[PDB]
Design a protein around this ligand. Structure first.
Ligand SMILES: NC(=O)c1ccc[n+]([C@@H]2O[C@H](COP(=O)([O-])OP(=O)(O)OC[C@H]3O[C@@H](n4cnc5c(N)ncnc54)[C@H](OP(=O)(O)O)[C@@H]3O)[C@@H](O)[C@H]2O)c1
Ligand SMILES: NC(=O)c1ccc[n+]([C@@H]2O[C@H](COP(=O)([O-])OP(=O)(O)OC[C@H]3O[C@@H](n4cnc5c(N)ncnc54)[C@H](OP(=O)(O)O)[C@@H]3O)[C@@H](O)[C@H]2O)c1
Lengths: 123, 325, 123, 325
């Protein structure tokens, strides 16, 4: 509850309460078995040798309770590969792309006849 | 490997330790106490655990006279002590800076030792900050009164709090943890303690492997004379055996007689080698009242290759108390 | 590998693993003989009294494995003089300018006659 | 200059040191041991290296009785010791906090000293954290049992790990390193050690400059009587000389007889001044069994101006083992 958790992102410190990260139990920072391999015991911190400006938006995802947004100086290719590492889910990724506008839900279902399907794609 | 490290620390202890609770200075005589330690030290045991609360301090006196009489090297022994109860005064209890420094200096004059290997906070103290405990434990290590320190019966949040104060203030973190672990007490050492071992490097030195003699199976026909349940002031152990939850446990121990018969072992040897079956438990503190019991319990190291995966699965179906993470 | 390397850029501290910087052995941070003169032994760190916002793009060059890009608040004259100091090569400089668009590969070869060459430049 | 700093540290040691391995407390008598140290101390040697493993602790006893008998000032001597092996018990080995503190205190009662100058970790310990070693080495320096500490046979990654713990926790980093360096062992002190010296300030105190007597050239006609290869329990040195890799080395030493003849020197004086030819090596630990050998080896300081660049190029063509960075 009061236990403060220090997360070190390539030399940048990000102290947080433990009950903030434990709000989302299936992410990398919420599951203690997942983040166990990043613990530095001599410094009492979690060290991630990752991107530095991406994590302030990842940290405020846990503090606000699910409101993440891309920082203005972090591109879409860099920041989307950080959401996949920190494991914020298939569910909070879809809320991210719609805000972004990268909403391409096009899935052409075939006609299923296997030739009615096959001739359909011909036209 | 008979000798194994204590946590991640460099302190090499044996896999079986000898405790002085009840027996030494209490139940058995000084001459039998001299004979049990010679039998233990000649079998490779170097871990000898005592406390200042045991026998109102008389248990450390008996242990102290044996090391001087036998002329054992202090280098070959690992002597551990526990501090929390010093006496009747209000300043003689707790984990304050006054009592850790006084109570360890008082124990080092009864043990007649220059220093002790591991000093153990015998229980947590809610009326003391964790800074004061970790600074006082660091103080008696830097003065040379102790080499290491550990905690006894502290929850894993209290151990992780004491670890984070030591990194904050550049103090010394604890290396060890004494937790009760037998076949009828599994929740802390299988769930809570393994998580702490891989994170910060705290090992477990488990005590009472036979649950004060219950798991030896001697109490199945009632209360035998001259056992611990019939001693003065131990009505809490007689109420534990004769109650309906304690009568149910003896019905499980008869089912464990068949598994101990399939191996060559007995039921005390089975109940100790079951405690050493994992890499998390760094030692087991025995208790022995005579030389037949101690020779029997040191025979539990041979039963440890006999335990396969299948016998561990078979015992846990009889016990029916495996914890869930 | 496991070893962590603290690089201090004018009071801003960046910590990265040694096997990240050793991915590129010919740069200033990859060659131990080159970065030997910047080591502060009393603090156990590499001190560079250099530009501060330039180095987050220089650090993420090593972490991503060769994907550098200019930060949005660092101009082109400042940031290009940092790539030459950190010695990221003649090869990763050309990939930088093409992204930038500062691609001027114009090299007028003369006709080589030495007057066929010389009269050519007259026209 | 004959006196030179030990690393970047302020400790001024002589360029030749005397070691107690084998000769003291073992091979030669106590009366010859008194005569070799008087011959060494009157030639300006202040570095006297011993260990607790040497002669089961009897080598420190011989050294200890000479300093009391001769009445040498402790201020004028640099006494160094090595702590890894204390005895047969499992707690008497390693670089744990129990054995460093316990071990050093046992060596200071055999040496009859109040302190040694540099305590060495005699080899690395894989079963101990580096925090526990650096905290225990810092502890015996702040108690006043040692002034400095160094490491023996540690990989330059292990030395750089021990350095980064000392800056993390505000502890004391090591100043020194003992590494084997002769004409047939060049990889650590010419490649790995130089990098460490300019980065963090660790010097080398190289031991066995004659490779236990091989490079003196005495073993070219087989095994002479009353040399170290014929002593009891040294079959590993006889197997090293008589093997086909060791017979090839003696064919190189005959080629070094011509280079030692061009100078005024001998082959032991050449093989020591070759070890002192660089600024990275801070000292050389000799070994001497009589007064003719020690007087010969202290004559290797005069050969050190005689080595030009060209003789160093000439020896390395004969040796054929120059390491590559
Ligand atoms: N808070 C703490 O840190 C804490 C608390 C308690 C104990 N401890 C440590 O752990 C040790 C005690 O463990 P424990 O004595 O409580 O449980 P055990 O499980 O260690 O108890 C052994 C006692 O039970 C009986 N027993 C043992 N082996 C037997 C055998 N093979 N056959 C028949 N009977 C046998 C003995 O005779 P009897 O049945 O006649 O008595 C003996 O006195 C102490 O020495 C103490 O140092 C620590
Ligand atoms: N791990 C470590 O840190 C470590 C390990 C080993 C040694 N050391 C240190 O280094 C020292 C030992 O060096 P070392 O003794 O092993 O190699 P040296 O190369 O130091 O060995 C000298 C021995 O070889 C023979 N010798 C020396 N000079 C000679 C000469 N001019 N002519 C003929 N024979 C000569 C001697 O007589 P004999 O041939 O009759 O014996 C002598 O006992 C010890 O004192 C020890 O303190 C440290």
């Amino acid at each position: 509850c009061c236990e403060r958790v220090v997360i070190n992102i390539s030399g940048l410190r990000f102290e947080t309460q433990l009950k903030t990260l434990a709000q989302f139990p299936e992410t990398l920072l919420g599951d203690p078995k997942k983040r166990m391999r990043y613990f530095d015991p001599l410094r009492n911190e979690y060290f991630f040798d990752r991107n530095r400006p991406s994590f302030d938006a990842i940290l405020y995802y846990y503090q606000s309770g699910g409101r993440l947004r891309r920082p203005v100086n972090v591109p879409l290719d860099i920041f989307s590969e950080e959401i996949r590492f920190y494991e914020l889910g298939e569910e909070a990724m879809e809320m991210f792309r719609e805000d972004e506008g990268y909403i391409k839900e096009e899935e052409r279902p075939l006609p299923e006849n296997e030739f009615q399907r096959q001739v359909w794609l011909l036209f | 490997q008979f000798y194994r490290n204590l946590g991640k620390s460099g302190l090499r202890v044996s896999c079986l330790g000898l405790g002085t609770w009840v027996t030494f200075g209490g139940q058995i005589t000084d001459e039998m106490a001299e004979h049990l330690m010679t039998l233990a030290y000649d079998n490779g045991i170097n871990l000898f655990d005592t406390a200042e609360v045991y026998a109102a301090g008389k248990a450390e006196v008996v242990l102290g006279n044996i090391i001087k009489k036998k002329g054992w090297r202090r280098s070959s022994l690992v002597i551990t002590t526990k501090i929390f109860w010093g006496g009747k005064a209000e300043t003689e209890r707790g984990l304050s800076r006054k009592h850790i420094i006084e109570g360890l200096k008082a124990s080092l004059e009864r043990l007649q030792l220059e220093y002790v290997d591991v000093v153990f906070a015998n229980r947590p103290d809610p009326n003391t900050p964790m800074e004061e405990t970790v600074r006082a434990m660091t103080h008696v290590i830097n003065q040379g009164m102790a080499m290491y320190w550990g905690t006894s019966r502290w929850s894993s949040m209290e151990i992780m709090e004491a670890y984070s104060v030591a990194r904050q203030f550049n103090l010394i973190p604890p290396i060890c943890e004494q937790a009760e672990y037998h076949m009828f007490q599994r929740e802390k050492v299988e769930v809570q303690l393994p998580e702490l071992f891989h994170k910060i490097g705290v090992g477990a030195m488990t005590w009472s492997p036979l649950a004060c003699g219950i798991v030896s199976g001697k109490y199945d026909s009632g209360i035998p004379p001259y056992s611990r349940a019939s001693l003065k002031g131990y009505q809490w152990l007689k109420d534990k055996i004769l109650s309906e939850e304690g009568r149910r446990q003896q019905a499980k121990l008869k089912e464990l007689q068949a598994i101990a018969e399939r191996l060559g072992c007995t039921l005390p040897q089975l109940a100790i080698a079951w405690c050493l079956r994992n890499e998390g438990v760094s030692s087991v503190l025995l208790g022995a009242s005579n030389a037949e019991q101690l020779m029997e319990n040191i025979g539990a190291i041979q039963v440890l290759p006999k335990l396969s995966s299948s016998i561990v699965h078979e015992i846990d179906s009889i016990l029916g108390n495996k914890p869930y993470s």
